[PDB]
Design an enzyme around this catalytic site. Structure first.
Site, PDB file in Angstrom:
ATOM      1  N   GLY A  33       2.655  -4.008   2.602  1.00  0.00           N
ATOM      2  CA  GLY A  33       3.755  -2.697   3.027  1.00  0.00           C
ATOM      3  C   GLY A  33       4.874  -4.457   3.544  1.00  0.00           C
ATOM      4  N   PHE A  37       9.276  -7.038  11.051  1.00  0.00           N
ATOM      5  CA  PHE A  37       8.250  -8.476  11.400  1.00  0.00           C
ATOM      6  C   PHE A  37       8.147  -9.592  10.388  1.00  0.00           C
ATOM      7  CE2 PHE A  37       5.364  -4.998  10.149  1.00  0.00           C
ATOM      8  CZ  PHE A  37       4.967  -5.917   9.964  1.00  0.00           C
ATOM      9  N   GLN A  39       5.483  -9.335   6.771  1.00  0.00           N
ATOM     10  CA  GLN A  39       5.090  -8.460   5.137  1.00  0.00           C
ATOM     11  C   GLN A  39       3.839  -8.179   5.829  1.00  0.00           C
ATOM     12  OE1 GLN A  39       7.010  -9.990   1.908  1.00  0.00           O
ATOM     13  NE2 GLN A  39       6.307 -11.865   3.371  1.00  0.00           N
ATOM     14  N   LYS A  55      -1.076 -10.026   7.711  1.00  0.00           N
ATOM     15  CA  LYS A  55       0.070  -9.778   8.554  1.00  0.00           C
ATOM     16  C   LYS A  55       1.034 -11.319   8.836  1.00  0.00           C
ATOM     17  CE  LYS A  55       2.870  -7.314  12.156  1.00  0.00           C
ATOM     18  NZ  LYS A  55       1.813  -6.707  13.730  1.00  0.00           N
ATOM     19  N   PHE A 105      -7.011  -8.819   9.564  1.00  0.00           N
ATOM     20  CA  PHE A 105      -7.459  -7.873   9.497  1.00  0.00           C
ATOM     21  C   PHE A 105      -8.219  -7.190   8.874  1.00  0.00           C
ATOM     22  CE2 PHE A 105      -3.115  -7.606  12.034  1.00  0.00           C
ATOM     23  CZ  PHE A 105      -3.359  -7.994  13.072  1.00  0.00           C
ATOM     24  N   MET A 107      -9.075  -4.388   6.171  1.00  0.00           N
ATOM     25  CA  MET A 107      -8.745  -3.739   4.746  1.00  0.00           C
ATOM     26  C   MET A 107      -8.744  -2.283   5.344  1.00  0.00           C
ATOM     27  SD  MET A 107      -7.253  -2.123   2.208  1.00  0.00           S
ATOM     28  CE  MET A 107      -9.384  -2.900   1.439  1.00  0.00           C
ATOM     29  N   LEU A 108      -7.907  -1.226   4.980  1.00  0.00           N
ATOM     30  CA  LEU A 108      -8.076   0.129   5.726  1.00  0.00           C
ATOM     31  C   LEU A 108      -7.663   0.602   4.343  1.00  0.00           C
ATOM     32  CD1 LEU A 108      -9.722   0.837   8.581  1.00  0.00           C
ATOM     33  CD2 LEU A 108     -11.159   0.706   6.784  1.00  0.00           C
ATOM     34  N   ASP A 154       2.971   1.923  20.092  1.00  0.00           N
ATOM     35  CA  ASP A 154       3.824   3.069  18.549  1.00  0.00           C
ATOM     36  C   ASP A 154       2.729   3.630  17.788  1.00  0.00           C
ATOM     37  OD1 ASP A 154       6.229   2.550  16.511  1.00  0.00           O
ATOM     38  OD2 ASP A 154       5.460   1.287  15.494  1.00  0.00           O
TER      39      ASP A 154
HETATM   40  C1  LIG Z   1      -2.766   2.411   5.518  1.00  0.00           C
HETATM   41  C2  LIG Z   1      -2.029   1.161   6.022  1.00  0.00           C
HETATM   42  O1  LIG Z   1      -1.101   2.457   6.305  1.00  0.00           O
HETATM   43  C3  LIG Z   1       0.365   2.266   6.878  1.00  0.00           C
HETATM   44  O2  LIG Z   1       0.054   0.577   7.480  1.00  0.00           O
HETATM   45  C4  LIG Z   1      -0.331   0.952   8.985  1.00  0.00           C
HETATM   46  C5  LIG Z   1      -0.006   0.108   9.856  1.00  0.00           C
HETATM   47  O3  LIG Z   1       0.121  -1.523   9.087  1.00  0.00           O
HETATM   48  C6  LIG Z   1       0.418  -2.474   9.986  1.00  0.00           C
HETATM   49  O4  LIG Z   1      -0.225  -3.797  10.051  1.00  0.00           O
HETATM   50  C7  LIG Z   1      -1.540  -3.913  10.840  1.00  0.00           C
HETATM   51  C8  LIG Z   1      -2.975  -4.090  10.704  1.00  0.00           C
HETATM   52  C9  LIG Z   1      -3.021  -3.384   9.510  1.00  0.00           C
HETATM   53  C10 LIG Z   1      -4.556  -3.125   9.219  1.00  0.00           C
HETATM   54  C11 LIG Z   1      -5.328  -3.004   8.355  1.00  0.00           C
HETATM   55  C12 LIG Z   1      -4.725  -2.471   6.876  1.00  0.00           C
HETATM   56  O5  LIG Z   1      -5.083  -2.238   6.156  1.00  0.00           O
HETATM   57  C13 LIG Z   1      -3.534  -2.937   6.769  1.00  0.00           C
HETATM   58  O6  LIG Z   1      -2.187  -2.846   5.610  1.00  0.00           O
HETATM   59  C14 LIG Z   1      -2.917  -2.954   7.800  1.00  0.00           C
HETATM   60  O7  LIG Z   1      -3.993  -3.842  11.124  1.00  0.00           O
HETATM   61  C15 LIG Z   1      -3.211  -4.514  12.577  1.00  0.00           C
HETATM   62  C16 LIG Z   1      -4.184  -5.055  13.608  1.00  0.00           C
HETATM   63  C17 LIG Z   1      -3.888  -5.243  15.028  1.00  0.00           C
HETATM   64  O8  LIG Z   1      -5.069  -4.765  16.154  1.00  0.00           O
HETATM   65  C18 LIG Z   1      -2.216  -5.208  15.699  1.00  0.00           C
HETATM   66  C19 LIG Z   1      -1.853  -5.185  14.085  1.00  0.00           C
HETATM   67  O9  LIG Z   1      -0.249  -5.390  14.546  1.00  0.00           O
HETATM   68  C20 LIG Z   1      -1.635  -4.458  13.038  1.00  0.00           C
HETATM   69  C21 LIG Z   1      -0.809  -4.776  11.313  1.00  0.00           C
HETATM   70  O10 LIG Z   1       0.253  -4.751  12.613  1.00  0.00           O
HETATM   71  C22 LIG Z   1       1.779  -3.269  10.346  1.00  0.00           C
HETATM   72  O11 LIG Z   1       2.468  -3.411  10.751  1.00  0.00           O
HETATM   73  C23 LIG Z   1       2.270  -1.684  10.281  1.00  0.00           C
HETATM   74  O12 LIG Z   1       3.495  -1.410  10.074  1.00  0.00           O
HETATM   75  C24 LIG Z   1       1.980   0.175   9.328  1.00  0.00           C
HETATM   76  O13 LIG Z   1       2.291   0.516  10.119  1.00  0.00           O
HETATM   77  C25 LIG Z   1       1.224   1.803   5.052  1.00  0.00           C
HETATM   78  O14 LIG Z   1       1.517   3.591   4.527  1.00  0.00           O
HETATM   79  C26 LIG Z   1       0.823   0.833   4.650  1.00  0.00           C
HETATM   80  O15 LIG Z   1       1.147   0.520   3.616  1.00  0.00           O
HETATM   81  C27 LIG Z   1      -1.343   1.300   4.273  1.00  0.00           C
HETATM   82  O16 LIG Z   1      -2.153   0.190   3.167  1.00  0.00           O
END
Ligand SMILES: C[C@@H]1O[C@@H](OC[C@H]2O[C@@H](Oc3c(-c4ccc(O)c(O)c4)oc4cc(O)cc(O)c4c3=O)[C@H](O)[C@@H](O)[C@@H]2O)[C@H](O)[C@H](O)[C@H]1O
EC number: 2.7.11.23
Length: 344
Positions: A33, A37, A39, A55, A105, A107-108, A154
């Protein structure tokens, strides 16, 4: 024209090529997504043999600088969570790549909003809500560690990820807006449905803002719907007053933006005049009925369900009200939330 030798676009974002290899290590899989900030991409870490999310911060100094503040907060959290026991997706690595800061990070695949939408917004059981609540409070207890004192800023269902969609384990992401206590920078923070009254009122804020968000989230998890679904800040404040009543006078007397929502009477504070359907009167949309404490829970779907007795609902309602305390000094704190009778 030519942005970053053709690697970037006109919005300072890296142009994601599905399949590219980085540093003989990361195989870009797909875009997850976009955000202000930059992508997030899904990638395979070939060295460690595991899926990661990366990120990719915008190639622009202001966004580089905010992300460097977050890298420092994440590293600080690594120095105190060696066992990874607290329910936070920890930073695995940071590096620069083609003038982009990149944060790696685990992946979940699914977040808490995904779980709600799968139940068709009927909500999860109170037993599952209990487990999620216990983990979120533990994570907030961790952030409240004196050396950390990190405000997440947030908390929302989309930022709580599921360790496995059928498991009960969760992990918090997205410290893009976070700050340590004392180093507050922004005024327009938190997702609006989960924004605390002190932020709406332009007051100084602290770690208690995250516990407010948690109360809203827990109610939404069990009912299926956002507790306070305001479309703008005035609508958000009024929906909060529909449920919780007028905020204490001693808070509004020191609230910079009290008069955006309320009028001080010659006597006390009341809401501002309307022109014509008045919101439900202050405090009359009772949490007791939103939760269906005596009527089989939300929609009456929980009648006779274990863990959904009237006594269980009264405990849940009591914890939520401690979380939705208008007073951020008396709002329940993570350690004491964990000793509440809702968690036995
Ligand atoms: C499960 C995910 O949920 C949502 O993203 C979750 C959040 O991820 C954040 O992406 C991040 C993820 C992240 C970790 C694992 C994932 O699989 C992933 O897709 C993202 O982990 C972080 C861990 C930290 O300690 C600090 C962070 O700033 C982030 C972070 O920004 C984004 O910045 C946010 O905008 C977003 O809301 C979306 O629907 C996305 O498409 C989907 O795959």
């Amino acid at each position: 024209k030519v942005y970053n030798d053709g690697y970037d676009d006109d919005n300072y974002d890296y142009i994601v090529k599905n399949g590219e290899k980085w540093m003989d290590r990361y195989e870009i899989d797909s875009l997850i997504g976009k955000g202000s900030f930059g992508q997030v991409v899904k990638a395979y870490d070939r060295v460690e043999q595991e899926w990661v999310a990366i990120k990719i911060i915008k190639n622009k100094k202001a966004f580089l600088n905010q992300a460097q503040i977050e890298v420092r907060l994440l590293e600080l959290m690594n120095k105190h969570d060696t066992e990874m026991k607290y329910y936070i997706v920890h930073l695995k690595r940071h590096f620069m790549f083609r003038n982009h800061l990149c944060l790696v990070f685990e992946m979940l695949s699914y977040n808490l909003y995904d779980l709600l939408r799968n139940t068709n917004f009927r909500g999860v059981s109170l037993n599952l809500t209990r487990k999620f609540a216990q983990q979120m409070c533990t994570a907030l207890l961790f952030l409240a560690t004196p050396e950390l004192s990190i405000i997440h800023c947030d908390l929302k269902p989309e930022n709580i990820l599921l360790c496995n969609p059928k498991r009960s384990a969760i992990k918090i992401v997205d410290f893009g807006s976070s700050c340590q206590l004392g180093q507050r920078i922004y005024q327009y923070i938190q997702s609006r449905f989960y924004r605390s009254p002190e932020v709406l009122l332009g007051m100084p804020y602290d770690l208690a803002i995250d516990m407010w968000s948690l109360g809203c989230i827990l109610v939404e998890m069990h009912t299926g719907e956002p507790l306070f679904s305001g479309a703008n800040e005035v609508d958000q404040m009024n929906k909060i007053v529909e449920v919780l009543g007028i905020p204490p006078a001693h808070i509004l007397d020191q609230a910079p933006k009290a008069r955006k929502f309320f009028e001080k009477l010659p006597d006390t504070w009341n809401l501002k005049k309307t022109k014509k359907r008045e919101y439900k009167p202050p405090g009359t949309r009772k949490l007791h009925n939103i939760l269906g404490v005596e009527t089989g829970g939300p929609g009456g779907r929980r009648a006779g369900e274990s863990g959904h007795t009237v006594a269980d609902y009264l405990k849940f309602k009591d914890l939520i009200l401690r979380m939705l305390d208008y007073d951020p000094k008396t709002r329940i704190q993570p350690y004491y939330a964990l000793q509440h009778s809702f968690f036995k």
